[PDB]
DNA sequence: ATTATGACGCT
DNA sequence: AGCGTCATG
């Protein structure tokens, strides 16, 4: 009872923007906004490939991973924007830098952990007990929590969205202890607060919607954050937990939705996250290993202990590029030259980031993949990485490469190369 | 013939 | 170090 710490310490959102890939080019280009579309990448097979999507196309069952013809089966007025092309390969540097953009109003807020190109965590600890002294007692306004959404209410003893909404929240601020400083509800509430405060600074300075959750940990958090998006917001209480996790199939949680989450529903017998509660500490721990048993068993009853990062850039640069089928690299001219397009990007990519980020990537890491191998990488080399040079970066990269080619001619390759993938690490303050 | 990344765990 | 897993704009 009194020494069940029950993982309430913390305050922590994740903020993800909507659809952002989209949301960049409806930015650029007002005739897209409000309409069904999507960003794709490349076009001569099979219309390009979708990455992003608007909720207006979602609505008609546009999807990530579609190819754009198929999308347009569904949705015939689908508009598309293309992901530029630079050196024969798509270019992402319009949505880092919108990216960037993000992160640096966040910052203002709170240390963030950049989790991805679109989102990031926040330790609101500190700014909720700095905000609390400030109110003083003073209870919490329905009007400050204009977009927020209180996961499992309302409940108990209206027909639209936005009522439910306000029903929720009522139930939830006429239950709130306002005059503890320590109730982590009232923690989480101010921490709400706060992020309306947060994604209306992003809107108001880039003209981008977020969604967002708010939580006692980070696995909480982005499940919050994906309960009510678009442009919405949802606090995930702590005593919210045993019924939103009673229904929630295990592969929903972060870290949960591939093998290992295949293996806890085969090996347990389970379906649902809060079944997990069943099992004993150890139990998890013989199945799934000290570190996976530890954290499901402390998961399943909403609790996680992984902090947020102080890191708001990335720890690696890379470039890379598939070959699919009939357009795999078989000579040595052509290996050498697509090298060389992937070293140029990064050579470009990484001139920026010293003389914005004052730091160097001191490792060049090599990695490629044979046709007729199933796995995604078939081969990884690392190499030094002490001049930002692309056409030295592109002779080593094909040195530590050139020994995978089973060709007795040295003009062939084989077996053909599907990937090229060129990657800078190991940074370092300069 | 989802592609282009980026993080992190394992040994 | 090099490999595998997970995530997905
Ligand atoms: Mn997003
Ligand atoms: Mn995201
Ligand atoms: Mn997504």
């Given at each position: 009872?009194?020494?069940?710490?029950?993982?309430?310490?913390?305050?922590?959102?994740?903020?993800?923007?909507?659809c952002?890939?989209v949301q960049?080019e409806q930015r650029?280009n007002p005739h897209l906004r409000n309409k069904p579309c999507a960003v794709?990448?490349?076009?001569?097979?099979?219309?390009?490939?979708?990455?992003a999507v608007s909720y207006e196309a979602r609505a008609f069952?546009v999807?990530?991973?579609?190819?754009?013809?198929?999308?347009?089966?569904?949705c015939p007025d689908l508009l598309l924007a293309?992901?530029?092309?630079?050196?024969?390969?798509?270019?992402?540097?319009?949505?880092?830098?919108?990216?960037?953009?993000?992160?640096?109003?966040?910052?203002?807020?709170?240390?963030?952990?950049?989790?991805?190109?679109?989102?990031?965590?926040?330790?609101?600890?500190?700014?909720?007990?700095?905000?609390?002294?400030?109110?003083?007692?003073?209870?919490?306004?329905?009007?400050?929590?204009?977009?927020?959404?209180?996961?499992?209410?309302?409940?108990?003893?209206?027909?639209?969205?936005?009522?439910?909404?306000?029903?929720?929240?009522?139930?939830?601020?006429?239950?709130?202890?306002?005059?503890?400083?320590?109730?982590?509800?009232?923690?989480?509430?101010?921490?709400?607060?706060?992020?309306?405060?947060?994604?209306?600074?992003?809107?108001?300075?880039?003209?981008?919607?977020?969604?967002?959750?708010?939580?006692?940990?980070?696995?909480?958090?982005?499940?919050?954050?994906?309960?009510?998006?678009?442009?919405?917001?949802?606090?995930?209480?702590?005593?919210?937990?045993?019924?939103?996790?009673?229904?929630?199939?295990?592969?929903?949680?972060?870290?949960?939705?591939?093998?290992?989450?295949?293996?806890?529903?085969?090996?347990?017998?389970?379906?649902?996250?809060?079944?997990?509660?069943?099992?004993?500490?150890?139990?998890?721990?013989?199945?799934?290993?000290?570190?996976?048993?530890?954290?499901?068993?402390?998961?399943?009853?909403?609790?996680?202990?992984?902090?947020?990062?102080?890191?708001?850039?990335?720890?690696?640069?890379?470039?890379?590029?598939?070959?699919?089928?009939?357009?795999?690299?078989?000579?040595?001219?052509?290996?050498?030259?697509?090298?060389?397009?992937?070293?140029?990007?990064?050579?470009?990519?990484?001139?920026?980031?010293?003389?914005?980020?004052?730091?160097?990537?001191?490792?060049?890491?090599?990695?490629?993949?044979?046709?007729?191998?199933?796995?995604?990488?078939?081969?990884?080399?690392?190499?030094?990485?002490?001049?930002?040079?692309?056409?030295?970066?592109?002779?080593?990269?094909?040195?530590?490469?050139?020994?995978?080619?089973?060709?007795?001619?040295?003009?062939?390759?084989?077996?053909?190369?599907?990937?090229?993938?060129?990657?800078?690490?190991?940074?370092?303050?300069?």
């Amino acid at each position: 009872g009194p020494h069940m710490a029950t993982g309430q310490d913390r305050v922590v959102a994740l903020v993800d923007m909507d659809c952002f890939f989209v949301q960049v080019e409806q930015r650029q280009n007002p005739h897209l906004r409000n309409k069904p579309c999507a960003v794709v990448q490349y076009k001569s097979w099979k219309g390009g490939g979708i990455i992003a999507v608007s909720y207006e196309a979602r609505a008609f069952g546009v999807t990530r991973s579609m190819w754009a013809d198929d999308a347009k089966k569904l949705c015939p007025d689908l508009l598309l924007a293309q992901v530029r092309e630079s050196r024969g390969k798509a270019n992402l540097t319009k949505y880092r830098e919108a990216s960037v953009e993000v992160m640096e109003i966040m910052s203002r807020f709170a240390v963030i952990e950049r989790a991805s190109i679109d989102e990031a965590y926040v330790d609101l600890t500190s700014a909720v007990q700095e905000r609390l002294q400030k109110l003083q007692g003073q209870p919490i306004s329905a009007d400050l929590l204009p977009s927020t959404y209180i996961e499992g209410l309302p409940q108990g003893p209206t027909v639209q969205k936005e009522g439910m909404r306000k029903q929720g929240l009522f139930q939830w601020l006429d239950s709130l202890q306002i005059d503890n400083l320590t109730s982590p509800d009232l923690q989480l509430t101010v921490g709400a607060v706060i992020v309306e405060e947060m994604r209306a600074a992003i809107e108001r300075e880039t003209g981008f919607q977020c969604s967002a959750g708010i939580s006692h940990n980070k696995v909480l958090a982005k499940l919050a954050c994906g309960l009510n998006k678009p442009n919405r917001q949802t606090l995930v209480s702590h005593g919210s937990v045993p019924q939103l996790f009673s229904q929630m199939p295990i592969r929903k949680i972060r870290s949960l939705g591939g093998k290992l989450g295949a293996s806890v529903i085969e090996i347990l017998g389970i379906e649902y996250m809060g079944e997990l509660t069943q099992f004993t500490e150890s139990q998890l721990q013989s199945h799934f290993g000290e570190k996976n048993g530890s954290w499901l068993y402390a998961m399943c009853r909403g609790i996680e202990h992984d902090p947020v990062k102080p890191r708001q850039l990335p720890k690696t640069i890379g470039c890379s590029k598939n070959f699919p089928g009939k357009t795999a690299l078989a000579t040595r001219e052509q290996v050498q030259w697509w090298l060389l397009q992937l070293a140029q990007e990064l050579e470009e990519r990484l001139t920026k980031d010293r003389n914005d980020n004052d730091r160097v990537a001191t490792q060049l890491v090599v990695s490629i993949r044979v046709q007729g191998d199933k796995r995604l990488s078939s081969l990884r080399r690392c190499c030094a990485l002490t001049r930002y040079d692309a056409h030295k970066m592109s002779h080593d990269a094909f040195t530590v490469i050139k020994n995978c080619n089973t060709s007795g001619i040295q003009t062939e390759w084989s077996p053909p190369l599907t990937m090229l993938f060129l990657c800078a690490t190991k940074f370092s303050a300069s």
